[PDB]
Amino acid sequence: RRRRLKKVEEEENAATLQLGQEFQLKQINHQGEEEELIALNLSEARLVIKEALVERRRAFKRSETREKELESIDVLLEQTTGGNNKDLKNTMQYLTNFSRFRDQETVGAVIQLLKSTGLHPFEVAQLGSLACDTADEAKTLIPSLNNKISDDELERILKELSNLETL
């Protein structure tokens, strides 16, 4: 490791997919193995978070429409988390009211769907979080999609994404 002083750094900007220094495409985990940046859409993030909470609840104990699921998450949240959880409560509440894919099967289909484009993890996560009806909407809401995927593929991908929308 050599000297370091002020160098000009690329200002963070999602439109340019310049996510910064710690959110680069190529990441290094705790084992030193190379990995890709794991970006989650709202539905994927909701499943991942609540999958860990149930396991956490299992650890301590051993040693559906929108409203009922919201209450079930709320009661589980308070039981399985420590203090100063004011942020996680808002997060779980926000993920249940803004998710488009309910169960694992629906989310799994989305992942197997959008990985054929070869887009950036940030872009695919955005395409699974925002409901866009026309290719133009996705081209302006995600400026990075411009000149990466043709309107022919985007139009059909959006149609299939809207296809597997519960309720």
Partner 1 sequence: MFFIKDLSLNITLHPSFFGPRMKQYLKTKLLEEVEGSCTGKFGYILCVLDYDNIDIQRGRILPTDGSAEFNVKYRAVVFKPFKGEVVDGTVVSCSQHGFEVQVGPMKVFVTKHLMPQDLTFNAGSNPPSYQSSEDVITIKSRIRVKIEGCISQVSSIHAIGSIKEDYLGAI
Partner 2 sequence: NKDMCPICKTDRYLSPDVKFLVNPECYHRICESCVDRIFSLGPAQCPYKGCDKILRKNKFKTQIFDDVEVEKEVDIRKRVFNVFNKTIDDFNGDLVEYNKYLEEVEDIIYKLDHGIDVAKTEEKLRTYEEL
Partner 3 sequence: HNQFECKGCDNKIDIYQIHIPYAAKLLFQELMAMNITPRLYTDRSRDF
Buried/exposed code over 22-58 (b: 16+ C-beta within 10 A; e: otherwise): eeeeeeeeeeeeeeeeebbbbbbbbbebbeebeeeee
Q: Does 164 bind partner 1 (CB under 8 A)?
A: no
User: Which residues contact partner 2 by CB under 8 A?
Assistant: 139-140, 146
10 φψ region: left (φ > 0), alpha (ψ -120 to 50), beta (else): beta
What span, in angstroms and rounded, lies between the C-alpha atoms of 106 and 100? 9
Report the residue from 2, 4, 30, 61 that binds partner 1 according to the rule CB under 8 A: 30
Q: Does 42 bind partner 1 (CB under 8 A)?
A: yes
Q: Does 4 bind partner 1 (CB under 8 A)?
A: no
CB 56 within 8 A of CB 66: no
Q: Select the binding partner of residue 94 from partner 2, partner 1, partner 3, none (C-beta < 5 to 8 A, by kind).
A: partner 1
Site residues for partner 3, 6-65, by CB under 8 A, read: 6
Residues contacting partner 3: total by CB under 8 A: 4
What span, in angstroms and rounded, lies between the C-alpha atoms of 145 and 143? 5
Q: Which residue ranges make up the site for partner 1 (CB under 8 A)? A: 12-16, 19-20, 22-23, 27-30, 37-42, 44-45, 48-49, 52-53, 55-56, 59, 81-88, 90-91, 94-95, 97-98, 122, 125-126, 129-130, 132, 137, 140-143
